[PDB]
Amino acid sequence: MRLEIPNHTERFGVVRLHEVQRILELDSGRVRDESPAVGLRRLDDADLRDVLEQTAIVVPTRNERLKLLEGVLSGIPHEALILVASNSSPDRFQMERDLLEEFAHLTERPALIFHQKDPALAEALRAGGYPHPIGEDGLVRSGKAEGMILALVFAALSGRRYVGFIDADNYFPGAVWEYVRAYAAGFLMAKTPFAMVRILWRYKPKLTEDEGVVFRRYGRVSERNNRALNQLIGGVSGFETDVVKTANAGEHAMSLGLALRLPLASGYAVEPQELVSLLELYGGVFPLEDEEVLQHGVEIFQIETRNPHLHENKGDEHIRDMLLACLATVYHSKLATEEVRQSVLEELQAAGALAPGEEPPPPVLYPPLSSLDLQAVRKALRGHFSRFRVP
């Protein structure tokens, strides 16, 4: 993989937020003659695969088409682990298990699969002193955040350093292959054990070009979200930026060391929160206690894939609460300067937030997973790793 090298990079504390870098070439072969290009970077295949051997790839599902989900698997680079995180119909789950075993069997490759509403998992967490997501029904509640918590525990238990997430909603297994290598690309390029890789794919329309009156309005929001994020940064920085182009980077990857360090939000605020949290924690505008991070800093990679991201999902409550969740997390940052709060307030109640006079509900964040006793977890799950493990 050849990548362009971000011409600019945003320094915010010990955070290093790099501009969007385009993938120039998907598979740039086996390097022998290095030629040193200053402007771009050629990732050697074998390096990429070595990173991927240390990577778990989480593929969440809640009653996704199987045909699609299986197609997503075929495309995942061989070296990566593969964890299917499930919240599907009791019996749909069963099919997914069957689907994964067959695949893993045939591809001679290891995999785990688990279910959000599994009670063992609920016990596992509270044994490790992290009861924070358990429902009243006595088990880990549904939610995006809740999913990741389970994902990161398995990543951890499995001994991988890197974990990244793929949307099973993808007609294109080749697109998946690129997205995963791009994570590897990111961690390769990275120079600190605290790293995040956030994929995007961005598209230019026009007056004489079709997109449907719903793909259009989807761009109109991410643009604003990214905006609201640079508004937050700029607010602290004093210098107006435009570096975040990935506020809603659902498909993202993150070194476990970084992952376990961040808090997490429940709704659509997740992706946007990640960023906010990183800046709150490592922006400098606060005492930062953590030695190793302050010492190596954080790099956030924003990589632009060659393949279109075509995931089937739309309508109001999607695209709308998409907006509300995000600008709420900004309004509430411990980093917001008054003008940032206000600028953001307006877009909300002047697009429905029931005014005048109204505030978004604050973020509801889980605490970092560093908290969680992993040994207690390993002890608490002894007699069940059979059933998570797919031979």
List residues binding a second copy (CB under 8 A): 2, 23-30, 35, 37, 39-40, 42, 45-46, 49, 71, 74-79, 106-108, 171-178, 306-308
- What region does 138 belong to: left with phi over 0, alpha with psi -120 to 50, or beta? left
CB burial string 61-74: b at 16+ within 10 A, e below: beebeeebbbbbbe
Span between the terminal Cα atoms of the chain, in Å: 32
Q: What are the Cα distances from residue 384, in Å, to 9, 84, 98, 141, 351? A: 45, 17, 18, 21, 49
Instruction: Quote the least distance from Cβ 203 to Zn ion, whole Å.
Output: 12
251 is in an annotated binding site: yes
For residues 210, 215, 219, 225, the Cα torsion angle rounded to the nearest 10 degrees is: 170
Contact pattern for Zn ion over residues 306 through 345, marking x by CB under 5 A: ---x------------------------------------
Question: What distance in Å separates the CA atoms of residue 125 and residue 119, rounded to the nearest whole number?
Answer: 10
11 near Zn ion, judged by CB under 5 A: no
242 is in an annotated binding site: yes
Contacts of 240 (CB under 8 A, 6+ apart): 230, 234
Which of Zn ion, a second copy, none has residue 49 at its interface (CB below 5 to 8 Å by kind)? a second copy
Contact pattern for Zn ion over residues 106 through 145, marking x by CB under 5 A: ----------------------------------------
Instruction: Quote the least distance from Cβ 206 to a second copy, whole Å.
Output: 12
Closest among 44, 10, 40, 37 to 22, alpha carbons compared: 40
Which of a second copy, Zn ion, none has residue 309 at its interface (CB below 5 to 8 Å by kind)? Zn ion
Distance of CA 285 to the CA centre of its chain: 25
Candidates 292, 339, 346, 358; binder of Zn ion (CB under 5 A) is 292
Question: What distance in Å separates the CA atoms of residue 364 and residue 302, rounded to the nearest whole number?
Answer: 26
64 is in an annotated binding site: no
47 near Zn ion, judged by CB under 5 A: no
292 is in an annotated binding site: yes
Instruction: Quote the least distance from Cβ 108 to a second copy, whole Å.
Output: 6
Contact pattern for Zn ion over residues 197 through 236, marking x by CB under 5 A: ----------------------------------------
272 token code pair = 């946007």
Question: What distance in Å separates the CA atoms of residue 29 and residue 144, rounded to the nearest whole number?
Answer: 37
Which of Zn ion, a second copy, none has residue 316 at its interface (CB below 5 to 8 Å by kind)? none
304 near Zn ion, judged by CB under 5 A: no
> By CB under 5 A, how many residues form the interface with Zn ion?
8
Q: What are the Cα distances from residue 325, in Å, to 215, 245, 360? A: 19, 17, 8
Backbone angles phi, psi at 341, to 5 degrees: -55, -50
HSE toward the beta carbon, residue 163, CA cutoff 13 A: 24
CB burial string 352-365: b at 16+ within 10 A, e below: ebeeeeeebeebeb
Q: What are the Cα distances from residue 383, in Å, to 33, 124, 157, 191, 224? A: 51, 12, 15, 39, 48
The residue among 89 and 295 lying less far from Zn ion, judged by its C-beta, is 295
92 token code pair = 């749909």
91 is in an annotated binding site: no
The residue among 45 and 373 lying less far from a second copy, judged by its C-beta, is 45
Instruction: Quote the least distance from Cβ 239 to Zn ion, whole Å.
Output: 12
338 is in an annotated binding site: no
311 is in an annotated binding site: yes
Instruction: Quote the least distance from Cβ 73 to a second copy, whole Å.
Output: 8
Which of a second copy, Zn ion, none has residue 172 at its interface (CB below 5 to 8 Å by kind)? a second copy
Residues annotated within a binding site for Zn(2+)? 8, 19, 242, 251, 292, 296, 309, 311
Contact set with Zn ion (CB under 5 A): 7-8, 19, 167, 242, 251, 292, 309
Residues annotated within a binding site? 8, 19, 169, 242, 251, 292, 296, 309, 311
